[PDB]
Amino acid sequence: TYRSIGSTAYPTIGVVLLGGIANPVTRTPLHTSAGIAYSDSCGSIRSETRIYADEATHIYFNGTESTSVRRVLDRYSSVFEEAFGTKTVSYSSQNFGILSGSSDAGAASIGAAILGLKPDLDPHDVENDLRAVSESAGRSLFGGLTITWSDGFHAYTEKILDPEAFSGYSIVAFAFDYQRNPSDVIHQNIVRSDLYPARKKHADEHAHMIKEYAKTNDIKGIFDLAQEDTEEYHSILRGVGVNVIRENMQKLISYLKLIRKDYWNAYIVTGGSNVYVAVESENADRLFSIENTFGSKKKMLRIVGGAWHRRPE
Ligand SMILES: Nc1ncnc2c1ncn2[C@@H]1O[C@H](COP(=O)(O)OP(=O)(O)O)[C@@H](O)[C@H]1O
Numbered sequence: 678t679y680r681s682i683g684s685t686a687y688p689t690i691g692v693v694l695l696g697g698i699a700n701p702v703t704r705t706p707l708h709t710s711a712g713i714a715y716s717d718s719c720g721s722i723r724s725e726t727r728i729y730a731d732e733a734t735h736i737y738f739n740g741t742e743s744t745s746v747r748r749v750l751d752r753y754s755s756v757f758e759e760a761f762g763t764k765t766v767s768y769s770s771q772n773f774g775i776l777s778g779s780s781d782a783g784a785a786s787i788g789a790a791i792l793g794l795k796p797d798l799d800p801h802d803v804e805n806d807l808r809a810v811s812e813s814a815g816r817s818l819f820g821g822l823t824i825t826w827s828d829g830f831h832a833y834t835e836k837i838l839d840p841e842a843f844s845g846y847s848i849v850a851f852a853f854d855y856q857r858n859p860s861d862v863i864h865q866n867i868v869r870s871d872l873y874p875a876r877k878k879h880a881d882e883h884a885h886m887i888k889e890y891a892k893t894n895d896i897k898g899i900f901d902l903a904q905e906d907t908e909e910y911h912s913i914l915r916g917v918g919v920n921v922i923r924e925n926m927q928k929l930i931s932y933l934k935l936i937r938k939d940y941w942n943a944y945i946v947t948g949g950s951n952v953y954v955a956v957e958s959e960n961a962d963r964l965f966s967i968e969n970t971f972g973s974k975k976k977m978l979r980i981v982g983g984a985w986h987r988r989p990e
């Protein structure tokens with residue numbers, strides 16, 4: 678028997694932005710969404726996880742002990758008993774350079790560690806258990822561009838494009854320093870909007886459009902749609918009191934409308950205080966070098982693959 682296993686996953690960015698979860702425990706998405714897994718050129722932006730045999734159950738985030746994760750570990754106690762010789766395992770996670778979408782990565786890394794222990798497991802089944810840790814875990818488990826179909830009862834994640842399809846594109850992230858609204862605050866309020874039912878329908882409509890664009894690798898059509906979805910999403914949120922796009926972020930966006938005339942770009946805003954800007958590779962350095970970032974820090978990002986594990990120790 679072994680003593681521990683390591684694994685790694687990459688953070689995610691919504692493309693069809695998810696708002697609302699069926700239940701605070703199982704965290705099933707109330708509607709269909711889509712996303713991409715991202716990192717930087719070196720793959721340095723990531724979440725690393727270690728699951729190991731222990732006398733008692735410990736959960737560690739960035740070296741800090743934590744009093745959701747235990748639920749997943751317990752459900753797969755049989756896997757660990759076989760691999761380690763005990764059901765009692767501890768979890769240790771370390772995040773690096775992640776902007777938004779950290780929880781997705783942490784959850785996916787758990788899944789890839791489990792699949793690494795019992796490879797014949799159905800990853801789509803494991804994904805269901807992982808949503809308790811983060812509702813968008815599928816994005817990071819499968820990588821690339823995914824669509825997660827959902828009616829609020831059952832959710833299923835599908836790979837639509839590999840990261841290689843995005844070889845000609847880059848994402849420049851502008852990180853602002855504004856305090857962010859917890860994701861749970863967003864899920865809680867968006868359902869209160871009168872426009873929510875319509876939003877659930879349009880979200881599904883957009884996902885289908887993304888799948889068609891995928892047929893001919895219309896990468897630009899997909900990011901353009903993501904900008905439109907971003908605008909709808911955050912209009913609904915503002916209407917319920919959740920304002921993600923703050924002053925300097927609005928300013929950056931207005932700047933982007935001008936630059937778009939010069940060379941193509943499209944932006945996405947999730948729940949955090951970041952503006953993600955899609956752009957062609959030949960223009961990435963150019964965008965990355967602009968001066969008036971309105972106090973924001975800049976990161977160069979790429980689309981990457983799904984969670985993976987290492988040989989058991
Ligand atoms: N590596 C990890 N493993 C498990 N849970 C994590 C990990 N990183 C963060 N989390 C949990 O997810 C929460 C943040 O999730 P969320 O609000 O979705 O932020 P983000 O959008 O950046 O993921 C944190 O408060 C933490 O409790």
Ligand SMILES: C[C@@](CCO)(CC(=O)O)OP(=O)(O)O
Nearest residue numbers: 691694695777860947948949
């Ligand atoms: C709010 C959102 C996910 C919340 O579960 C929207 C989305 O990306 O689909 O973004 P973020 O919290 O990961 O930043």
